[PDB]
Every structure is written in C-alpha cells, then in structure tokens.
Amino acid sequence: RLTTLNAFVAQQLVRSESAALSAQLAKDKVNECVKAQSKRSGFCGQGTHIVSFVVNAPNGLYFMHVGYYPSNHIEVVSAYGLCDAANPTNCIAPVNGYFIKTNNEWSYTGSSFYAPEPITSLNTKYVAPQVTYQNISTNLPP
Amino acid sequence: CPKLEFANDTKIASQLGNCVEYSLYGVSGRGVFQNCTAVGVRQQRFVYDAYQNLVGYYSDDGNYYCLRACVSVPVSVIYDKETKTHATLFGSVACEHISSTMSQYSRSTRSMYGPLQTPVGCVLGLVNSSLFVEDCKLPLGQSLCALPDTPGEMRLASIAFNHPIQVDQLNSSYFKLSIPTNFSFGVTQEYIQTTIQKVTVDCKQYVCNGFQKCEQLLREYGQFCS
Amino acid sequence: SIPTNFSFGVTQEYIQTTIQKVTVDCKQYVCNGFQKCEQLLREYGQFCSKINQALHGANLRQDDSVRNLFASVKSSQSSPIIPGFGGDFNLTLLEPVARSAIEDLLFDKVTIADPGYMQGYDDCMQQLICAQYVAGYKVLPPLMDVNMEAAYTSSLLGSIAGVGWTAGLSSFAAIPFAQSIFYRLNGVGITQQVLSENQKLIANKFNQALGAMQTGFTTTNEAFQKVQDAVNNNAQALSKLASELSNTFGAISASIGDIIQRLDPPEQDAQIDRLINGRLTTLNAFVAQQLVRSESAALSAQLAKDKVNECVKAQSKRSGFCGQGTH
Amino acid sequence: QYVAGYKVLPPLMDVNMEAAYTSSLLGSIAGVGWTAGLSSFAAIPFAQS
Amino acid sequence: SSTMSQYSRSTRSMYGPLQTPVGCVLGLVNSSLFVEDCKLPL
Amino acid sequence: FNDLSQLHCSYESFDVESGVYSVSSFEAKPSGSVVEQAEGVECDFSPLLSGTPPQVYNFKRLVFTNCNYNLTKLLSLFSVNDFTCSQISPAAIASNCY
Amino acid sequence: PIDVSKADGIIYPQGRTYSNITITYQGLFPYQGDHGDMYVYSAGHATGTTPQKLFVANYSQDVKQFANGFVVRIGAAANSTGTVIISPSTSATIRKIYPAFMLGSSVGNFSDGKMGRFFNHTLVLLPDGCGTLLRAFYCILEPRSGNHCPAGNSYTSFATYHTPATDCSDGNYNRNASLNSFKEYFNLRNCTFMYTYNITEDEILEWFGITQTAQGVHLFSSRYVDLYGGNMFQFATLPVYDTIKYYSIIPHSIRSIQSDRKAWAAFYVYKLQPLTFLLDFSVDGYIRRAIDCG
Numbered sequence A: 001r002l003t004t005l006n007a008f009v010a011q012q013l014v015r016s017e018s019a020a021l022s023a024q025l026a027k028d029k030v031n032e033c034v035k036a037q038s039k040r041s042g043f044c045g046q047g048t049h050i051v052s053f054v055v056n057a058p059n060g061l062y063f064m065h066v067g068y069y070p071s072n073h074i075e076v077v078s079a080y081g082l083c084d085a086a087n088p089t090n091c092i093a094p095v096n097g098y099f100i101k102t103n104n105e106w107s108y109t110g111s112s113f114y115a116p117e118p119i120t121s122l123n124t125k126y127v128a129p130q131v132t133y134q135n136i137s138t139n140l141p142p
Numbered sequence B: 001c002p003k004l005e006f007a008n009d010t011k012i013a014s015q016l017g018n019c020v021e022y023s024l025y026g027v028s029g030r031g032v033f034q035n036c037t038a039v040g041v042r043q044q045r046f047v048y049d050a051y052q053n054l055v056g057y058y059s060d061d062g063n064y065y066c067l068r069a070c071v072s073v074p075v076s077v078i079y080d081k082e083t084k085t086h087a088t089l090f091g092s093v094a095c096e097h098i099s100s101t102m103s104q105y106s107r108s109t110r111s112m113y114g115p116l117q118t119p120v121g122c123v124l125g126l127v128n129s130s131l132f133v134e135d136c137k138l139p140l141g142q143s144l145c146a147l148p149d150t151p152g153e154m155r156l157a158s159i160a161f162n163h164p165i166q167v168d169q170l171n172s173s174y175f176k177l178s179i180p181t182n183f184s185f186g187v188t189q190e191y192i193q194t195t196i197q198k199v200t201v202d203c204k205q206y207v208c209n210g211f212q213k214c215e216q217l218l219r220e221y222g223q224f225c226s
Numbered sequence C: 001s002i003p004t005n006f007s008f009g010v011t012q013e014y015i016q017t018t019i020q021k022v023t024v025d026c027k028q029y030v031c032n033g034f035q036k037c038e039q040l041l042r043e044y045g046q047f048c049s050k051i052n053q054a055l056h057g058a059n060l061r062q063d064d065s066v067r068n069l070f071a072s073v074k075s076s077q078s079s080p081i082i083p084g085f086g087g088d089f090n091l092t093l094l095e096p097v098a099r100s101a102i103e104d105l106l107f108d109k110v111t112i113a114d115p116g117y118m119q120g121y122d123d124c125m126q127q128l129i130c131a132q133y134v135a136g137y138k139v140l141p142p143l144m145d146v147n148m149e150a151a152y153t154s155s156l157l158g159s160i161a162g163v164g165w166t167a168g169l170s171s172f173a174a175i176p177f178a179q180s181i182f183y184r185l186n187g188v189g190i191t192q193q194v195l196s197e198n199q200k201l202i203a204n205k206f207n208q209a210l211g212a213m214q215t216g217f218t219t220t221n222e223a224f225q226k227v228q229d230a231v232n233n234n235a236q237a238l239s240k241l242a243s244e245l246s247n248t249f250g251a252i253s254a255s256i257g258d259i260i261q262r263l264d265p266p267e268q269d270a271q272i273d274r275l276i277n278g279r280l281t282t283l284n285a286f287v288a289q290q291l292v293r294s295e296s297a298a299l300s301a302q303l304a305k306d307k308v309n310e311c312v313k314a315q316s317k318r319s320g321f322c323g324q325g326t327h
Numbered sequence D: 001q002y003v004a005g006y007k008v009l010p011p012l013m014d015v016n017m018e019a020a021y022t023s024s025l026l027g028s029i030a031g032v033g034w035t036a037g038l039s040s041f042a043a044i045p046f047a048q049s
Numbered sequence E: 001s002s003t004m005s006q007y008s009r010s011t012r013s014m015y016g017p018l019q020t021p022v023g024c025v026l027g028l029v030n031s032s033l034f035v036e037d038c039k040l041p042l
Numbered sequence F: 001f002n003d004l005s006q007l008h009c010s011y012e013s014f015d016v017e018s019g020v021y022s023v024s025s026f027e028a029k030p031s032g033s034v035v036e037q038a039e040g041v042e043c044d045f046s047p048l049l050s051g052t053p054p055q056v057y058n059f060k061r062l063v064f065t066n067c068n069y070n071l072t073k074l075l076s077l078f079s080v081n082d083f084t085c086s087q088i089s090p091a092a093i094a095s096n097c098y
Numbered sequence G: 001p002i003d004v005s006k007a008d009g010i011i012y013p014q015g016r017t018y019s020n021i022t023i024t025y026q027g028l029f030p031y032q033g034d035h036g037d038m039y040v041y042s043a044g045h046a047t048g049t050t051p052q053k054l055f056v057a058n059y060s061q062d063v064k065q066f067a068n069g070f071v072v073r074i075g076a077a078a079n080s081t082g083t084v085i086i087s088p089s090t091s092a093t094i095r096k097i098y099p100a101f102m103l104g105s106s107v108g109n110f111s112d113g114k115m116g117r118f119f120n121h122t123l124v125l126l127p128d129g130c131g132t133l134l135r136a137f138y139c140i141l142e143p144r145s146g147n148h149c150p151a152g153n154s155y156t157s158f159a160t161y162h163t164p165a166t167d168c169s170d171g172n173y174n175r176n177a178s179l180n181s182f183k184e185y186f187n188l189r190n191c192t193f194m195y196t197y198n199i200t201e202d203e204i205l206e207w208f209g210i211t212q213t214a215q216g217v218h219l220f221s222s223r224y225v226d227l228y229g230g231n232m233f234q235f236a237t238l239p240v241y242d243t244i245k246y247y248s249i250i251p252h253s254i255r256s257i258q259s260d261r262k263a264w265a266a267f268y269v270y271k272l273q274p275l276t277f278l279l280d281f282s283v284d285g286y287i288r289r290a291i292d293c294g
C-alpha cells in the first residue's frame, strides 16, 4: 500500500514540475499574444495569429487563437526598391509590404494579401541604396 | 551434449541462408549463417559482440561463418481503427515468407499470401494503387499511407508532399511576387494542464482503515506516512 | 571604443528533436513463444499492455509534434534551388541539388550505421541495429521520406533567402542571397557603402567563414560531440534492452528457452515470476526515461522551431539569441 | 561529507571574479541599454541612464 | 602522503610550494600566469 | 486470436473512425536445426559407477568438458531414492548443456 | 617494469573473445610494473672442463605466496650480452632458460632447520631436454639419506644440474636428464601421473602462466599460438585434488666448462590477485591494448 503511495507521491511530484512549467508558459501565453499582439512565428498560435481568447477549465486553461490563413496564391510582379539614377540616396522602402506594377506603374501592396494601393509616404521609409536596385525617371512618387 | 542421428540436414551448408535454430553445444538459440573469411582468433570459435551474442564460428573445414542471428520478420500490423480493414506489414524484407509457415496461434486472411512488395518491405492484405493523399492520418512508414475512402479489401496510398507555390529566382532587378488573394481565419486551439486536482489522503484510513491492531502495527514504520 | 576589424565567427548548435520511435512487444520480446510463458503472461496482462499503449501514445505525441514542426517549417511559397546561387558566393557545400553535401558529410562523420530501411533483412543476411530482434523491439521507419526531409530543408532554405527582408509570413518576394545579406548587414547596424566598396573582400571573408566549419568539424567542435552523445544515448537506450536479458536480477540464465527447457514447473513458476518482474520493472523505468525525454524533446523541438523562426527566417532581437554575441 | 563519504564540488571559479562579472554587467547595461547593438560600450552616467 | 589508505597511487619526479586558494597541489610548480581561454578549469 | 481480436485484446471497439494501431504480434518461425560444435567422444562415467564410494568428508569429484554424455546408460544403472535440485532441475540431466 | 598498455602479460580469456571492441572484464590479474621475484640461473663451478661443485643461491630457501597463480617471463634479458653471474670478469651472451616449479599448501623446516619443507602430495614441474619437455607430477617427494641430501648428512640446499655436452648435443637428451637431475636428490612415492609436452627451442622471448582452481591446475603458454604477438593461451589442464597455497622455484645449475661460461637470463615471476582490467580487442582477436582498474 505504502510503496504505491510512494509511487503516487513521486509521480505527483513529476506532474508538479510539469504543471509548474505549464503554468509559467501559460501565463507567458496570456501575456504575449492575448494582452498585446506579439510578432512571434507560431509560438502561441499556428499560422499568422491575430486574436487569442482564454478560458479556465477544472484542470487547466484552454486557449483559442483565431488567425488569418492564406489561400489562392497567384503570381504578380513586384520590386525591391526604387531609387533615382541621378539621386541614388533617395529611396523608398515599403514598411511591412511590397511593390507592384499595375499602371491604372509602381504601387504598394501589403505583406499578406493582394491589396494594391498607390505609393504613399505613410507606409514607407527612406534607406540608403545598394548596387542591385532599380532606377526610373518618368513617373515618381511625391 | 549427447549424441544424435545426423544425416545430411545438420550442416551449416545444409541450412545456409536460412533462419534456423542453433545449438553450439550449450550456446543455443536461433541463428543465421553466412559464409565469411577468417575473422578473429581461430582457436576460440566462440566470438561474441559487445552485448553477449555470438557473431561467428570457425567450422571444421576451415570456412568461417558470420552469425547475424535468426532475426525474424520485422513485425507490424495495422488496422484502420474500427473500419474493418487490417493488414500486415513486413519491414524492409522481400516476400520470401508466405501465409503457410507461421505459428503463434493463428492468422485471419478473411477474404481469399500474395506479395505486396513496397519500399517499407513486404505487405500482405493490400493492393497496389498510386494514390496521393496529403492530409492522411494513417501513415505506414517512410512515405506510405492509406485512404479512408467511403466486405472488400484495402488499397495502398502514399504520404503526399504539399508542394509550395513555386516562384523563380531572378538575377535581374525585376522580380515576381507570389501573393495570396483569398483569406480565412484558421482556429488554433490548445490546452495546458495548469492546475492538477489537489487530492490528499491520510495513512489511517487508506492505509489502515482505522483498525486498532493496524493502528498499533502502523507506528513501526511510523513517520513514513508523515 | 569600437573595433576596426570584424570577422564572422561560426557558432555550431545542435538540439535533439526526435527520438527514434522504438516499440517493444508484450508477446515476442517478453515471451518468445514458450508455452508456460504463454499461459503465464496473460494474468500479468494489463501491466505490459498499459505500458505499450503508453509508448504508443508517446510515439503518437512525437508524431504530432513532428507534424506541427513541419507545418511550422512548411513555407507556403518557395523558390527552386538554382545553379550558381549566391553569385560570387561559392556555397557548394550547402546546396541540396536527394541529399545535401553538408548533411552528407555530417552523416559520414558522425558514427552512424545504416538502420536498414530498405534491405535491412538483406543486410542481416549478407553481413547492433540488426539486434533489433535479437534483444527484441521494433523501431519504425521515420514519418518522412529522406526526400520529404530534403524537400522541407530546400523549402526553408529557399524561404529564408527571401524572407530576411520584410515581416509578414504570407507572401514571398525572394531576394538574391547577395542583396539579402547586404540588407541583413544593414539590419544589424552596418552601413551599405563600406560593404559596397568592398564586395570582393567581404565575399572572400564570407566564403572562408562558410568554409571554416567543415575543416573544423573535429573533436574540438562541441556540437559534433553532442550529436554523437545523443546517438550514444539512443545506443544506451537499446542497450538497456540488450544487456538486461543477460541481467538475471536473481534469475539463472538469459535464454528463456533454456530456462524452460531446464526447470521443472514447481520451480520454474517462481523463476519465470522472477523473470517477468525483472523485465517489467526494467521496461517501466525504460518507458519512464523516454517519456521524460519525450516532453524534453517536445520542449526542445518547440525551441528549435522558435530558433528557426527567429534567427533563420528573420533578424533576431534577443541579445545573443542563437549566436555568440552578434549573430 | 567526507565523514558521510562524499565530496561536494567547490566553486571552480572565485567569488571576487563573479563579483567582477556583476560589476561589468552593471557597467554594461547602461551602454547596451540605450541603442540596439552589442559591440561597443556606451557608459551613460547612471542618473541620465 | 604519509597517513594514507586504499590501495595504490604513485607520483613522477619532483610536495612543492603549491598552496592555492582551492587548497594544496601535488605535481605542479608555482607560476602565476593569465589564461583567458581556459578549457580545463582547475 | 484471429487478427482483429488481437487488436482488440484490451478493450472494446465500434464502427468507423480513423486511427493508427501499429501494435502487432507475429514472428517468422524457425524451420531448421543444427546440433554441432565440432565433434565429441564419450566421457567415461564408469569411474563414478565403479570404485569405492568415499565418505562425505572425502567426496570424490569428476569434471567433464569437451566430450559427450549419455544419461540413458547411467540412470538405468541407478536406484535413486530422491533427486532434488536447488535453482536447477532434475529433468535437465541430458537436455540442456553447459 | 611490465606494462599492460604495452600488452605485456595479459591472460587470454577462457571461452569467449571479441573483435575491435573495448570492454572491461574481471579476473585474476597481477600488479602493473612490479619488481617481481627476479631470479637468474648460473652454471656451477668448473676447473677447466671436469664436473665440480655447484654455484647456486639461497633462493632454494626463499618462499613467496601463491595467492591466485603466478606468471613467469622467459628470455626477456636474452638475445643480449652481459656479465656472467659466476664469472664477473667474463662477459658473454644471454640465453633463455626455463624454471622448475614446486607447489603445495604446507611450508616446513628442513633437516638442518631451514624453512621450505613441504608436507603431503606436492606438485613438481620441470623443463627438460634443453627445455623441450615439460615433465610434471603431483606426487610425494622423498629425500634420501646420503651426503648433502635433504634427509641426509651435510645438507646445505638443493638444485638441479645440467651437462649440455651429454644432453644438449645432437639428439640424445640424455635419458630425460633434468628429471634424473632432480631425482639425484629425491624419490617418488604415492604418485599419480606423468605428463610430457612437446615444445621447440628458439631465441624469442615468451610468457608463461600457471594457476589452480576447483577445476584443476591450468597452464597457459604463448608458444602454442602467438609468437609475433604473445598472450597466455591455455594449453594444459592438470587433475589436482586440493588447493595450493604456496609456490617456489627450484634453482638450476649447469655443468659448464670454465673457459666458455655462458650465462642465462634473469627470469621474473609475478603474483596474481582478483582484479578487473579493460581490454581493447582489435579485429584480429589478439590482446594488444589493455589497462588496469587499480
């Protein structure tokens, strides 16, 4: 009786460090992408996570991530960066996005979905050029 | 060991290349034989591995024989759970053994033995079918699987690879982009055993049930329960 | 105080992810088809059935962990491996072209015997791993083909050559590896024009940095030793079946067939009882050890997924996250 | 413990030198804790830091 | 090495003045040098 | 017993689902036997069968190796009152070997 | 010193061996690099050619504990040139010689009170025929009552003689010379057996071992198997009826001439005690790298 109680306490102990690490990780989870919205890849939610939800349970915690998942991938033509031939130091680097040529000509699209929209200063930065960039002089952003 | 009638079918050559049993006058078990040149000390004839298993033997004619032992078929059987399709898989072996020479207790062929040679080995109970299922949850080793589908037999399939959308790398300043044009909201749900049920018990009821002779005898170990 | 000379050192880190999914049998391993053992194993029963169901569940946990880490490393979009990748970068050892050269020399350098995945019985026929029946257990072929793994490695390799520029884990805009690592060096805080007046010099020091390790793959590099230590721990795990048949633990002999061929029923009852308790306790401790290593492998594979998600497909932010100092 | 028949292993490195590490860290966190980078040293006065 | 026990241990050619912060050393020689790349921590 | 009860040898099951049960029980059964090591002549146990049986404090022992033993011609010349064996068996006089 | 890492003096395993594996194994082992029980064999005195008085030692009255067997090295100093033991002014070549063994569980005093007398049945081993024969008997020794005999008057010590002009000539071997040389002092009673062994003669140094246990006396020699290597390989099993607790070496002398006194090697004897080694067997199966645990 007592040595299967020894065993019982011993495996209770094992589940105790298991649940201690589990509780540490779980409170980390409810901190990172539940309170704020962190930028880790799959660390709390599979796929590109957006929103998370937390519910208690009589032996732990259940977590609900709802996140964007892509579909219908198609080929378009983007760019890397546009700098003037006469003024190489002026470049536009899209903040969290990519280029497109549609000519409704260079315009902006996000990093997730086919959402083209024209070149705006509000979602780009200025960085020094490199040897492998693109030059144009016929139609330029403000 | 005591003597026996020998005849021809007792030599190493009489059972070369066969999964047989061996009795090297006390060193007994089940072994295989393969013809090999003189390895190790000739005078010993009893050479063991790092884990106390005979690895060879010098025969009387001077031919050495590697003892790789009577390794069986590498045994597996699969059953598609509670859809009545179960069939057996033989790891990395030809179909040189068939549904005749078994033992154990028995084996049920059900309907109608029959080679299903595959990269995992030799399968019995399947039929060849070049099927490609990516999301299958019934793997058969390496890249082998089976189709759930919707009184017959069970068909073969492969663990398919979902090829990514291929985009050609361009050394030119122009480049081609691969973009998703449709979006969804996948739900990833997880559970964490943050709290265990906080269960306790004492030594006088679980271990003693309040019996007085038990109560006085329990104090000999005493502080153990404490 | 800022230095005027810089090199690229190479840090080598190995993390064990997947224990070989070994399975062991109530019937064949324990009993080996002996009739008194046949009629005595059943009233024990639930013990070995519970532990083999437990190892089945742990193996399935490992399998689903492997599936999850493949889902993590499966890039939605990828680029084919091209001839002359990197331009001036002679990255011939890293390229995959069935199998990649670097992991091939790692396979050769690490003391590995072939685990007979295609002609294992034929390998036993013509000439340790073949003792898989001799001790008695069965490890499955892995969840993936070697080409399935090759596709995964090529996919992640193609992805990280392009996703080192801009966040967003959906679209792929693969940069050439040169311009990619120029922008990476801009990310770590080095201006472009010093790199841009020294293309050949940075390329040459980059190539000698990437040629350093296969020359340095020896006893000095601790990562190769810990790879071999993981392999030796798997070897000790299988030895914990192999030697323990010989370990009588108060019994007489390892050969259960000789045990039953010698001993009379009124004494082989107690002797086979000694055998079964010794073997059941050893397997209990064994499955305990690899279940502990199972959650260790789960957390380690999760951390490895994080490592390939942070300092492989992006620019890291933790100080010395995966490299000694400035990775 | 030697009476008990075992030996705890002593610190293989001295107390004053982990003190030196901790002092170095106290100096360092001012330098690194202003702009990202691990190369140089940027010791702000700790008031301003 | 006077009041010993167990079975056997020997020493090569010359109990030097080796009184260190860890204790006392046998088989070395006094030399205070700097090692910033120590691999076998004494 | 058959193939499917062998799967369901621990619990009870039902109709239609997906699930892997790679647990198994069979083996590739032997079909051959070898009984040699080299050769062997018979060790003479007549020195036990002859001579004066000495006292218990002066017991006479004989060792046998690298030969043959035939128990069929030995116990036939015996009248055994009792035959007990601590952690070995009386039945293993000429079946197993050492 | 005897170096186990130099593969000097490791007993071959009894009934199982390995190949290219490193593994520990218990057994009976000596101590690494010992002084041993070094004895040298010197020829007797000579005045020209005629047979004269002996030239031997007090090693006939010195005893060491048998423990758990002992091993003897043969010809280690041979194939060289050193000073002759009896003639210090003479420097001659060094030739291998083989030792005679006496074994028992009792040590007593001789007729003159010197210790070394053995009671009950005694195990006597003797090389003979210029070392070709390996005669032995676990039988009863009987000293005689003559002059300079262990049961007779004027007793000092005991040894064995050798006349190689009559023994080590072409063929001959002089009616087992060395056996009758030992029997020139002694007689045999209550005897059990007489075993001979057939060993060639050369000038390559060799190992030897002798032990006893519940399954008899066992003798290990490398002459039968390994010459270019060398390990104590089991060759002889002797039917002993008890356990032996003491061992000693019979000194041997030679009826040499005075002018061309050729000396012999100083053989070494090492005792055996329960211990464990570590053995690194290569692919050949010969013991070429082993080491102690203690």
Ligand SMILES: *[C@@H]1O[C@H](CO)[C@@H](O)[C@H](O)[C@H]1NC(C)=O
Pocket: B117, B118, B128, B129, B130
């Ligand atoms: C299974 O069928 C396909 C298509 O006919 C064939 O290519 C393949 O070789 C077959 N498998 C075997 C093992 O023959």
Ligand SMILES: *[C@@H]1O[C@H](CO)[C@@H](O)[C@H](O)[C@H]1NC(C)=O
Pocket: A071, B182, B183
């Ligand atoms: C996106 O895919 C889902 C999948 O069924 C579909 O229901 C939906 O209509 C699609 N949306 C667009 C805009 O194509």
Ligand SMILES: *[C@@H]1O[C@H](CO)[C@@H](O)[C@H](O)[C@H]1NC(C)=O
Pocket: C004, C005, C006
């Ligand atoms: C940096 O040091 C290395 C190693 O000595 C040397 O080869 C290289 O030229 C140095 N570079 C500079 C810029 O000093």
Ligand SMILES: *[C@@H]1O[C@H](CO)[C@@H](O)[C@H](O)[C@H]1NC(C)=O
Pocket: C090, C091, C092, C093
């Ligand atoms: C690239 O590296 C490989 C391996 O070191 C070498 O064989 C090859 O010649 C190299 N090629 C160039 C162009 O440097």
Ligand SMILES: *[C@@H]1O[C@H](CO)[C@@H](O)[C@H](O)[C@H]1NC(C)=O
Pocket: E017, E018, E019, E020, E030, E031
């Ligand atoms: C070595 O010599 C110096 C100078 O005399 C002394 O300060 C130091 O304590 C010595 N070290 C040891 C270990 O004796």
Ligand SMILES: *[C@@H]1O[C@H](CO)[C@@H](O)[C@H](O)[C@H]1NC(C)=O
Pocket: G020, G283
């Ligand atoms: C014996 O072991 C060594 C050490 O690994 C190895 O290099 C050698 O190839 C082995 N011998 C054979 C014949 O394989």
Ligand SMILES: *[C@@H]1O[C@H](CO)[C@@H](O)[C@H](O)[C@H]1NC(C)=O
Pocket: G175, G176, G179, G194
């Ligand atoms: C050899 O010695 C034996 C003693 O055992 C003796 O009987 C025999 O005569 C000797 N040989 C010759 C040729 O005399």
Ligand SMILES: *[C@@H]1O[C@H](CO)[C@@H](O)[C@H](O)[C@H]1NC(C)=O
Pocket: G190
């Ligand atoms: C041999 O010695 C034993 C031991 O005392 C003795 O019993 C026996 O009679 C002796 N044999 C003789 C004297 O022939």
Ligand SMILES: *[C@@H]1O[C@H](CO)[C@@H](O)[C@H](O)[C@H]1NC(C)=O
Pocket: G198
């Ligand atoms: C012993 O050796 C001699 C050497 O000439 C040989 O003639 C003789 O036949 C050998 N005898 C045995 C029994 O081996």
